[PDB]
Design an enzyme around this catalytic site. Structure first.
Site, PDB file in Angstrom:
ATOM      1  CG  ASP A 152    -145.228 -16.504 -25.884  1.00 42.43           C
ATOM      2  OD1 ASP A 152    -145.877 -16.356 -26.919  1.00 42.43           O
ATOM      3  OD2 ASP A 152    -144.054 -15.991 -25.749  1.00 42.43           O
ATOM      4  CD  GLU A 158    -145.801 -14.326 -32.058  1.00 39.28           C
ATOM      5  OE1 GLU A 158    -145.094 -15.082 -31.453  1.00 39.28           O
ATOM      6  OE2 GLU A 158    -145.611 -13.064 -31.921  1.00 39.28           O
ATOM      7  CD  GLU A 159    -142.742 -16.307 -29.839  1.00 40.63           C
ATOM      8  OE1 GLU A 159    -142.103 -15.247 -29.995  1.00 40.63           O
ATOM      9  OE2 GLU A 159    -143.382 -16.549 -28.769  1.00 40.63           O
ATOM     10  CG  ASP A 193    -149.642 -13.560 -27.604  1.00 42.74           C
ATOM     11  OD1 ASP A 193    -149.117 -14.508 -27.063  1.00 42.74           O
ATOM     12  OD2 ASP A 193    -149.000 -12.899 -28.523  1.00 42.74           O
ATOM     13  CG  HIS A 203    -139.955 -14.125 -25.427  1.00 47.51           C
ATOM     14  ND1 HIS A 203    -139.766 -13.380 -26.570  1.00 47.51           N
ATOM     15  CD2 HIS A 203    -141.139 -14.785 -25.606  1.00 47.51           C
ATOM     16  CE1 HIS A 203    -140.806 -13.598 -27.381  1.00 47.51           C
ATOM     17  NE2 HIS A 203    -141.664 -14.431 -26.836  1.00 47.51           N
TER      18      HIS A 203
HETATM   19 ZN   LIG Z   1    -143.429 -15.141 -27.423  1.00 43.92          ZN
END
Ligand SMILES: [Zn+2]
Length: 311
Positions: A115, A154-155, A198, A280
């Site tokens: 990720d 992105e995060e 992703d 995550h």
């Molecule tokens: Zn992520």
């Protein structure tokens, strides 16, 4: 199948991939903390740029830098945009994010191996493995070229609502809409297909088609998986179909494709659903990747790219 590579061209293409290069030259250097605005993020940006500029095909590589408001105050972001032939009418666009998600101080550092360090590395390896063929297609003024997007931000920085996310993709889609292209009329319309990679590299991923518009390309990926399986070209892959599953998605999610989707760009969202077990958490690391799966995905994508672009 029609428009598939003859077997002999397929084995050559797969044979141009170098697993050690993918792992050590493209993946390992990315596996650092690389939150937006950090030194590590800047170092990764420069590594992507330099690597892409080194490809002999002579890509056009440009940054899209900008400053945006965040829950942490103003932060700089920089998307890396590589377009093989900027004169071509349209392109296949492959995308991923190169930032890593910010965790609180005093946490076990998060490096986001699935990720999205693996997605980033896959794009670099594809561009290198197919460099001679891509160079020749550009020299022949092929009307569909290749574009790679390495998106920043992105995060979420603090999981602070819906506008704390997708910094880079929101900015880049707005920028592309403002830039003329021929025939265009803008760089948004130059994107023939936007394939977003992703959450890749964990064992046992499952992919579903999220967009009926682009299901034909999802079926192509599935057919390529089955073909490579039967050709004895996949590892640790005991069933004929494991990754590309039929049917309605397990679930669909917000990601870097959204700003493009909302502007009419066709999207294929190549994301594992369910997400990796490590998602995550700071266990999203190199040691928890499944190397055979990484290389299997690389092989599937290489054949897809060669078929799509007639390489
Ligand atoms: Zn992520």
């Amino acid at each position: 199948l029609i428009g598939s590579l003859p077997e002999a061209r397929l084995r050559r293409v797969v044979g141009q991939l170098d697993p050690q290069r993918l792992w050590s030259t493209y993946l390992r250097p990315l596996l650092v903390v690389r939150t937006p605005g950090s030194p590590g993020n800047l170092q990764v940006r420069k590594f992507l740029e330099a690597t892409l500029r080194s490809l002999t095909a002579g890509w056009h590589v440009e940054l899209d830098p900008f400053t945006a408001s965040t829950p942490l105050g103003p932060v700089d972001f920089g998307n890396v945009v590589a377009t093989l032939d900027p004169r071509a009418a349209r392109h296949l666009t492959l995308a991923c994010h190169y930032d890593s998600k910010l965790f609180p101080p005093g946490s076990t550092p998060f490096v986001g191996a699935t990720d999205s360090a693996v997605p980033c590395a896959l794009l670099l390896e594809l561009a290198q493995a197919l460099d001679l063929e891509l160079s020749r297609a550009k020299k022949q003024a092929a009307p569909v070229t290749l574009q790679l997007l390495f998106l920043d931000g992105e995060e979420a920085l603090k999981e602070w609502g819906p506008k704390d996310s997708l910094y880079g993709s929101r900015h880049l889609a707005q920028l592309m809409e403002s830039i003329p292209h021929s025939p265009g009329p803008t760089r948004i319309q130059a994107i023939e297909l936007f394939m977003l990679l992703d959450l890749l590299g964990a064992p046992n991923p499952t992919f579903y088609s999220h967009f009926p518009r682009t299901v034909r390309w999802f079926h192509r990926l599935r057919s390529i998986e089955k073909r490579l399986h039967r050709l004895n070209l996949l590892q640790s892959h005991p069933q004929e179909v494991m990754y590309f599953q039929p049917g309605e998605p397990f679930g669909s999610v917000e990601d870097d494709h959204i700003p493009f989707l909302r502007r009419g760009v066709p999207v294929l969202h190549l994301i594992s659903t369910p997400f990796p077990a490590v998602w995550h958490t700071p266990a999203d690391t190199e040691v928890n990747l499944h190397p055979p799966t990484v290389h299997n995905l690389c092989r599937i994508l290489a054949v897809f790219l060669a078929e799509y672009l007639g390489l």
